[PDB]
């Protein structure tokens, strides 16, 4: 039927396949994430503390491995790219989630952050990709409100007619003004998110500080919920 | 034997079977096609769906002879040797279906309630191995009737196939096995699995109130339909088995429950109709695939 | 200042008429017509994907 | 790359011995391995073959049950276990390296050899012509060869190989699969053939080309060699 | 004094406008049509874990290289569907690959900004990284060999560059684009090449000198693919507005447009046939179309994929055409 050398070649191919199966096992059990944010956002501190608490000049992309409850995560960010984004964002339409970090103590560069989030949310290739948003640098906002020199109503007209939602949970005990401010910020972002979701992807908010030590668990919980939603869709339950 | 008669025996199983053939055969073919489409996309549930469809299709292929048999007042004249094949392929089929339903339930529970774990148990190879094991084990367990005689000539113009009135004596313990390890065990596993799924879904944050109610209604319908199809038969079967072991001499109860027993057997086929509907044609994706397939023809 | 120089160098070159280009392309397509398997399918004993 | 192997010495008839071949300088785990032997003045004959993954083993007819071949990948060593050694097994054993994929070149490296002295059908046959040709430097020579069954396959490949053994050392590959010059050979050598008869030609001889030329076939196991021709 | 630039632009426009008297449709109106073209799949190549971005045929028309997001290069044997090699990369986001004319090396690159060159013929039996070229400040989107010692790359930043592989440096740098450069194609005689960017324009360069030679415009949106006609005097492009176009170098014009009202997705790959009679194009609606290059009428469809078609290539002897998709399969058509 076929000669000796061809049999040896077929043997070589079968061994190559075995290795690929092994690799597939290692790849179906790792969850991939993408880290997006601006220069003033403290995403560098997040990545550094996450790299420490667990376990090349024009380089383009970074890596970070960390593990929570024996589950593996990759977290990527882009280093030396230009300002435009519409082209390389297509490579990431199969990641599990997008982590978005915004600074909440600027009051001046915040409208640009809202526009950037709006552009990520409505991208054509990112439908069915969820977003975990971190409203980072909370304490700076605390001193800024307490001192009182810089108002917020001047930059945003509709702040006066706003009042705290009934389901707020201010935990440690702090002055109510900071609570009103931070919930107003979150409501802006969530309004953009709720505009045109269509039930295919969701947005999970969080209030964090860049130094605290509970971010990995937040990502773990949110990813749990995302994968559960996908499995409900796949196994013909809804 | 003891002379037992049913006035409605020749009018109700025949009609039910002539309806089940015509409605079920196309539906099971379409369900097989949809399950194969799912398998071609590396999904571990299409294997169980195909196995269920095959187990239904062999039963539907078998039923014409039983339809002929019931029309002659409990009588079979095709001959010995047809009884063993066509009767052994008449009960093991429902016990295959009840096992694959449990397999589907356990897979769904592992996928929803425990995500991010047990990735080695949700591959196609593991599913094929489990399917082979369940086929082999269930064909082995119900292989007792093949060894004994299965043709009985009564004194009141009958020729029964695979049953005798009164029972033989080795059939009682097979009946208790059939009612306790072939029905109750998979049903309890199914109920526990779907209860866990509902708790896990209530945990969710990205699912709105309406979808949770929809999942509740589709999870309860499955349990209810399995119970309503398989309950009265097994209840009468256990009632007969218990009384026989109590007093083999007494034969009064057989006469009163003859007609109910045969109608209860008739009722089971609605399950092989039902599964094509509950597991394929209510979901939108399978429905779309079916529509495309019919459009091609 | 560089854009002007580049454009100026990009202007003063030689063009031909479009009909000449069309004729050349059609001529090339007609000359190599027999050695093109996807247009004229090779008999099903000479292709290696039989 | 180098393969250095050892075992052997005088040994009594009826006993048993174990041979080993140590490999270094290349990826041992993705190559096949052969054992090839030759008598104190006769030609070469094939002994065994073990493939990558250890899922395929072959033996010659004269050692079908006495010998046994095995490998040890992480330790990077090859073994040959001999039992019930007769007196026709006195020879020198070689360790050869071979890989198989589209366009590869089998039998490309040969190791040095361990001497072993023992005190006192339906298979292709390859025939060499008169085994002596006198030559003067600068001329051209035309060593020839012949076969019984046609070596051409329906693939379009012809499986014939050529080797050279200078007086001092172990053989070298020259031509693989009837028309290809092996890596490192000068462009003087060239070979051709016609399906059953074959020919190797040397253009302008040099002082380092004298030796014995062996042929080989690889169409189906076992692999037969031929007597070879000497040049003086 | 930008008015000089504007006036020179108007002058170039006028000089272009003069030379057009007949269109290609009119001249080709009097030739027979190609008719229907049925092409059926022959092989299917399985083994990739994730979506496929690039592939490139060998010069002998039998071997084939493909790249995937999982971090693999696989070298196939098209006739028998065996696997010859599997090169694991160090960065998983690969976006291009190339296969050298001699058959000794392969190349790949991506979001890491590095072009990596691999050696396929070593004394040891493995495949080892020969060299890494650094110097770009953005993602590499295409790479093509000239010979065993020179390579041409295109980057996310506006620049294309030509490297020397022994001493890894840039001999020449091509500047002049405004957006991201996405594709590349070498002339058959290897003295010119064309590149297509995201500012809806394409340029022809001169390798020996390093100056931009001509600039073509149209297309209203991004350009995603580009390819030379076999002659060496024309090239065809594919865009995100669901149109393809054909330009000619000497006339400095545009000749024909391939578009239909049903198609509303963008093109991702373009390739010609051996004679230039057929233009093959991939689309985002899961299907690949076959166009008639001289009459602008569809001649056939290749519909066999379950996601978008990302790469496409025609062999040097014209026997086969291969296509790869985001469902992680390659299909050899004939």
Fourth-level CATH superfamily of chain A:
P-loop containing nucleotide triphosphate hydrolases
Q: Rg of chain A, please?
A: 22 Å
Shape of chain A: elongated
**By helix and strand content of chain D, what is the structural category?**
mainly beta
The N- to C-terminal Cα distance of chain A equals: 52 Å
| Proportion of residues in extended strands of chain A | 15-25%
* Number of separate domains of chain D: 2
Give the strand tally of chain A. 7
Radius of gyration of chain D: 18 Å
Protein name (chain B): G-prodeshotein coupled receptor 4
Family (chain B): Belongs to the G-protein coupled receptor 1 family.
GO molecular function (chain B): G protein-coupled receptor activity
Keywords (chain B): Cell membrane, Disulfide bond, G-protein coupled receptor, Glycoprotein, Membrane, Receptor, Transducer, Transmembrane, Transmembrane helix
What keyword list fits this structure?
heteropentamer; A: 238 residues; alpha/beta; Rossmann fold; 7-stranded mixed beta sheet; elongated; E: 334 residues; mainly beta; Methylamine Dehydrogenase, Chain H; 4-stranded antiparallel beta sheet
Can you tell me about this structure?
Chain E: Keywords: Acetylation, Disease variant, Host-virus interaction, Intellectual disability, Phosphoprotein, Repeat, Transducer, WD repeat. Chain E: Pfam families: WD40_Gbeta. The complex is a heteropentamer of chains A (238), B (297), C (50), D (232) and E (334). Chain B is an all-alpha fold and 297 residues long. Chain B is 72% helix and 2% strand. Chain B is built from nine helices and two strands, in the order ααααββααααα. Chain B has a two-stranded antiparallel sheet with strand order 1-2. In chain B, a hairpin with a 5-residue loop joins strand 1 (151-153) and strand 2 (159-161). In chain B, helix 3 (82-112) runs antiparallel to helix 4. By secondary structure, chain C is mainly alpha-helical. Chain C is 48% helix and 0% strand. Chain C is built from two helices and no strands. Chain C has helices spanning 2-11, 18-31. The longest helix of chain C is centred in the middle third of the chain and has 14 residues, at 18-31. The relative contact order of chain C is 0.08. Chain D folds into two domains: 1-119, no CATH class; 123-227, no CATH class. In chain D, the strands form four sheets. In chain D, strands 3, 4, 5, 8, 9 and 10 form a six-stranded antiparallel beta sheet that branches. Chain D has a five-stranded antiparallel beta sheet with strand order 15-14-13-18-19, with no helix packed on it. Chain D has a four-stranded antiparallel beta sheet with strand order 1-2-7-6, with no helix packed on it. Chain D is mostly beta strands and 232 residues long. Chains in contact: A-B, A-D, A-E, C-E, D-E.
